[PDB]
């Protein structure tokens, strides 16, 4: 299936994933498609931050759903 990850800039990355893809796998796919390291990714869906151990299905993320990416910052 397909999902869409939106950045604060307005960029919309298209990902081909499966319900059983781990959030770690999704972060790795984001890194491959945009160069964003997983450690500075913050995936958010339904007002909650996505955790590594779980999959997309655990968060009830279906096809053509929308994830939002916050790039982590440390010193403002």
């Amino acid at each position: 299936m397909q999902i869409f990850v939106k950045t604060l800039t307005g960029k919309t990355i298209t990902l081909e994933v499966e319900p059983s893809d781990t959030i770690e796998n999704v972060k790795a796919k984001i890194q491959d498609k945009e160069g964003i390291p997983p450690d500075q990714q913050r995936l958010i869906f339904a007002g909650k931050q996505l955790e590594d151990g779980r999959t997309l299905s655990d968060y009830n993320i279906q096809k053509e759903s929308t994830l939002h990416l916050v790039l982590r910052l440390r010193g403002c």
Binding site: R42, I44, G47, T66, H68
Partner: protein, 279 residues
């Protein structure tokens, strides 16, 4: 603005009618220098940001809440559990203490809980959201116009009030930099260099912090209170006392920053007073 058929006491009581409708602890008005009734009567008080055209507000889709205890809020003793504190990326201590005051070692950015957090509104990390606690007296200064003084004791770290007004774009702010008298109410949201782009103008709408006068040796400072940690364009401009303040002492903050390694005459009378706030 008519105010010509309004007398001295009528204008003063109209301004106090505006004051008595302000949310929270009472705000009062005294004049011990001249016979001026009140500040401008066209001003309207507001309790939050008034966004304008061309100002992209925080998208809640990029906001995430913690899942700390709903009863006692987040526990300041275990900041690692708090999800909405994982963005500071440092030892990671909560900005506030048990007594609700900002910590003396806390930096300039405050990350608070939002709607997505499961903690209650009594959470220790929602100080700015709960609003003002200090009654403030608006009084006529001798060389700076109106100013604000505190009425009760305020220890160092105590929250005071937010700088509110019209949030306007850089283009609109550049259009309204008419300062027509050394009168300026433009506060740039330049806390983060990567976002900036916005300015809060208090000329027509704002808070009592609008009367805060500049000092080269201030007792209060400004902090960026963030509820949508993802966005850095619009955020609360909370005033926190960094110095202990006695009652009747005027509340003052610096109109700029340290900026080290990088009217027009200042009448604050400080030992380090450069004769211009340039702000």
């Amino acid at each position: 603005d008519s105010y010509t058929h309004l007398s001295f006491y009528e204008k003063r009581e109209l301004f106090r009618k505006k004051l008595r409708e302000i949310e929270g602890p009472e705000v009062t008005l005294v004049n011990e220098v001249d016979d001026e009734p009140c500040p401008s009567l066209d001003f309207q008080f507001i309790s939050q940001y008034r966004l304008t055209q061309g100002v992209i507000p925080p998208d809640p889709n990029f906001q995430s809440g913690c899942n700390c205890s709903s009863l006692g809020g987040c526990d300041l003793n275990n900041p690692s559990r708090c999800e909405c504190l994982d963005d500071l990326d440092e030892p990671t201590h909560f900005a506030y203490d048990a007594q609700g005051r900002v910590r003396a070692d806390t930096g300039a950015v405050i990350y608070e809980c939002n709607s997505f957090c499961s903690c209650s509104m009594e959470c220790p990390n929602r100080v700015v959201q709960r609003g003002r606690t200090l009654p403030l007296e608006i009084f006529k200064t001798k060389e700076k116009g109106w100013g604000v003084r505190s009425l009760r004791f305020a220890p160092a770290g105590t929250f005071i009030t937010c700088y509110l007004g019209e949030v306007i774009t850089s283009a609109e702010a550049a259009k309204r930099d008419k300062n027509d008298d050394g009168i300026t109410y433009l506060f740039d949201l330049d806390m983060f260099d990567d976002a900036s782009e916005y300015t809060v103008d208090a000329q027509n709408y704002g808070d009592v912090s609008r009367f805060f006068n500049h000092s080269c040796s201030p007792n209060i400072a400004i902090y960026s209170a963030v509820r949508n940690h993802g966005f850095r364009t619009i955020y609360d401009l909370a005033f926190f006392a960094i110095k202990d303040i006695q009652p009747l002492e005027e509340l003052t903050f610096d109109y700029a920053g340290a900026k080290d390694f990088s009217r027009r005459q200042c009448k604050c009378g400080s030992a380090n007073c450069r004769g211009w706030l340039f702000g």
